[PDB]
Amino acid sequence: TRQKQELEEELALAQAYLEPLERLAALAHGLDKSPFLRVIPFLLTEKELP
Amino acid sequence: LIKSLAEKEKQLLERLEAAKKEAEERVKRAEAEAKALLE
């Protein structure tokens, strides 16, 4: 039961941010952990980017 | 903003490699002067 609850929580938390983490990693595939630039990623709102 | 940034950071690291090689060159000429003056 502990393994099932942990696996269900892990599957839910993975599905909550599955495609967006992949898209952000594909966008930031040049400086992911480079020691000159931190990349603040934010799952933010609709097209009000200004 | 993926491929060009990766290759630019690689080229920055290559210039750092060139600086480490010229520091090794300074170690080399220090060795050369030490042996020549001892001789």
Side-chain angles (χ1 to χ4, degrees), chain A residues 12 14 16 20 25-26 28 30 35 41 50, chain B:
Chain B
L1 50 90
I2 297 98
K3 57 182 183 294
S4 65
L5 268 298
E7 292 178 354
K8 282 183 291 181
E9 184 66 30
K10 183 175 88 275
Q11 198 274 128
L12 268 61
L13 293 174
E14 289 177 353
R15 296 183 299 175
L16 295 174
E17 290 171 352
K20 301 290 104 177
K21 290 182 181 180
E22 72 190 2
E24 192 272 331
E25 188 270 332
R26 294 185 187 273
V27 175
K28 176 177 70 176
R29 53 95 58 213
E31 186 270 332
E33 287 184 353
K35 191 261 178 292
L37 290 172
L38 193 148
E39 188 272 333

